[PDB]
Amino acid sequence: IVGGYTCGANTVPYQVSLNSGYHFCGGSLINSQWVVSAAHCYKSGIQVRLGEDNINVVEGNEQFISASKSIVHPSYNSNTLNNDIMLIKLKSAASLNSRVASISLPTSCASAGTQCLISGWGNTKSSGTSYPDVLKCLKAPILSDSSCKSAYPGQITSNMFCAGYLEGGKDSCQGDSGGPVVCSGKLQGIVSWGSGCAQKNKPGVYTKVCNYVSWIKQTIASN
Ligand SMILES: COC(=O)[C@@H]1C[C@@H](N)CN1C
Numbered sequence: 001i002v003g004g005y006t007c008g009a010n011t012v013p014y015q016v017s018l019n020s021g022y023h024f025c026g027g028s029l030i031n032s033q034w035v036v037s038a039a040h041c042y043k044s045g046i047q048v049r050l051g052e053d054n055i056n057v058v059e060g061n062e063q064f065i066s067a068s069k070s071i072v073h074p075s076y077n078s079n080t081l082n083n084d085i086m087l088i089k090l091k092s093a094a095s096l097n098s099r100v101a102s103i104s105l106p107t108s109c110a111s112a113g114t115q116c117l118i119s120g121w122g123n124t125k126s127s128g129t130s131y132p133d134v135l136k137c138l139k140a141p142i143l144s145d146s147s148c149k150s151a152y153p154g155q156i157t158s159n160m161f162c163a164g165y166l167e168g169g170k171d172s173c174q175g176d177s178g179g180p181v182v183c184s185g186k187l188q189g190i191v192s193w194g195s196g197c198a199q200k201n202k203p204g205v206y207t208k209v210c211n212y213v214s215w216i217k218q219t220i221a222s223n
């Protein structure tokens with residue numbers, strides 16, 4: 001997250017870190033057994049880390065649970081990043097509490113202008129490179145489809161939306177991948193892609209979660 005703020009320990013209780021020897025992506029806890037992340041975060045050997053603030057220090061509220069299976073969306077295209085969503089099942093159910101909690105799925109899509117919270121452990125620099133240990137947060141509005149499309153000609157599908165600031169300075173970045181965009185208590189987005197970070201007229205692009213609620217529910221119901 002570039003131009004954000006320190007969230008505060010365990011203030012984003014649905015935020016998970018995906019770890020394969022190191023943090024490599026964010027995710028969102030949607031029930032005791034399942035995490036939603038980006039398809040471009042797919043790899044084998046994933047440990048889901050819940051209750052994290054400082055990802056380099058065991059602070060006492062963590063739960064570390066290995067993934068038993070990952071399900072990348074059937075229509076994910078890694079070239080275009082269309083359908084950039086994946087589900088991860090935990091080997092054992094997380095113990096839910098005030099600091100480890102699921103986030104609700106949307107019942108409808110969120111509009112341009114809706115204020116959201118984007119979070120993660122990604123790069124905090126727009127030019128250089130610096131990775132934080134503690135969770136960073138950004139309040140950002142969803143941008144109109146038209147402004148999103150004109151920012152990224154030929155690249156925005158019906159499964160993507162832009163959020164952030166056309167002036168730049170505030171954005172998600174590398175390492176925030178797969179993490180949450182939460183608006184009015186609903187998971188509306190997944191950190192997907194962008195052209196650099198926090199650059200003028202290049203806002204972050206996010207997977208449009210409301211398009212996938214049926215797939216998520218049916219997948220969970222049979223897996
Ligand atoms: C380097 O840029 C990135 O990796 C991006 C930019 C962001 N808006 C979301 N990402 C995962």
Ligand SMILES: [Ca+2]
Pocket residue numbers: 052053054055056057058059062
């Ligand atoms: Ca920790």
